[PDB]
Amino acid sequence: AQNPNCNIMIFHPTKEEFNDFDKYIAYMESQGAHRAGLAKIIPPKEWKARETYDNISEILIATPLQQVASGRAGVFTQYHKKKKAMTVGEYRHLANSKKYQTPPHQNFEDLERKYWKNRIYNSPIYGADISGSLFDENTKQWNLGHLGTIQDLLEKECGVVIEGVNTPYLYFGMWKTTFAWHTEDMDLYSINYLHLGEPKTWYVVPPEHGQRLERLARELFPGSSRGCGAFLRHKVALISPTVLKENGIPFNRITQEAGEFMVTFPYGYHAGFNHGFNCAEAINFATPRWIDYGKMASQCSCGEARVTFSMDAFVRILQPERYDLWKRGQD
Numbered sequence: 001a002q003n004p005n006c007n008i009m010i011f012h013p014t015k016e017e018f019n020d021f022d023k024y025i026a027y028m029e030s031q032g033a034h035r036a037g038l039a040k041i042i043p044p045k046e047w048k049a050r051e052t053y054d055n056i057s058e059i060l061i062a063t064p065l066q067q068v069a070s071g072r073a074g075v076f077t078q079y080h081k082k083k084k085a086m087t088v089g090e091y092r093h094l095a096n097s098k099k100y101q102t103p104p105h106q107n108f109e110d111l112e113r114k115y116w117k118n119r120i121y122n123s124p125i126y127g128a129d130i131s132g133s134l135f136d137e138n139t140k141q142w143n144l145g146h147l148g149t150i151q152d153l154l155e156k157e158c159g160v161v162i163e164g165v166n167t168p169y170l171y172f173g174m175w176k177t178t179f180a181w182h183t184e185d186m187d188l189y190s191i192n193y194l195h196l197g198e199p200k201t202w203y204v205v206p207p208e209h210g211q212r213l214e215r216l217a218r219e220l221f222p223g224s225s226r227g228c229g230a231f232l233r234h235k236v237a238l239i240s241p242t243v244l245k246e247n248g249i250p251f252n253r254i255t256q257e258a259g260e261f262m263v264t265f266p267y268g269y270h271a272g273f274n275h276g277f278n279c280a281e282a283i284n285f286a287t288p289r290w291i292d293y294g295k296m297a298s299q300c301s302c303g304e305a306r307v308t309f310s311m312d313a314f315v316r317i318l319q320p321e322r323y324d325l326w327k328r329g330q331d
């Protein structure tokens, strides 16, 4: 069995190997990369996502989200308070202000210590989940707006044609902006490209151990767990690495820098935080190996998770027993 300790693997494809996206994902899996839940892909040196980032300041962040924490420094929830619209130029200036800027630090480890000590005492503003792309249309390799769609994969594997579309999302971050512990919708893959700015630190639980994280989360968030049998689908709970180690939960960590891709694998729980002003692009995707995860994915039916249009068909086809309850939660 490849990668039996479920370490995060880092790949350096050549320009030739960068041509065929599906083939390369399958290669990484042949080497055991999915056992970690997360892999890093460093593009060949010949590649670029676009020519420059000099002209992005007029992008609008229609609904910036202030991420307000409740709890203790290592075990907390966050809720999102909606703020007034602002441009990417305005958001960048805000990120760099004295109130929000990254503190002085020695290295990534010192900054990680500072994040876990102090996150809860601040409420950073995240420009998350903005439909759009920063890949140039002429970028033919690993262009996250030109991937094969999940609807087409389901149709190729299962023979059923379904409605829905699959487009990327932009994320504009600042120091301490945070992504809570989650797997993807329908336990899909994700791919995330850090276009510019400061790093993103990731934490991940191997898919084979995801239920250990779920059991800890039910213990640590007991109100939330009574409310919903899949409350991590609400994407609000944070647990620090120290607390994970105290409770024997297997995990790994890595820091993504600008110009790098990360891939999350089906049922790989992940969480993390941004170091300072940055912009990432991410999208979900599927492969043949995903189908069995999609069929078994948990679902939130309490009302909280509320998701895209395109999840309907995935539930309806892959999980017909669950469909009626889940759809009630959508309505």
Ligand SMILES: O=C(O)CNC(=O)C(=O)O
Binding pocket: 171, 178, 179, 190, 191, 192, 264, 270, 280, 282, 283
């Ligand atoms: O970058 C973020 O805030 C969150 N990203 C992801 O969870 C992802 O790409 O799967």
Ligand SMILES: [Mg+2]
Binding pocket: 055, 056, 057, 058, 059
């Ligand atoms: Mg612009």
Ligand code: NI
Binding pocket: 182, 183, 184, 190, 264, 270
């Ligand atoms: Ni994710």
Ligand SMILES: [Zn+2]
Binding pocket: 227, 228, 229, 230, 231, 233, 234, 300, 301, 302, 303, 304, 305
């Ligand atoms: Zn729920």
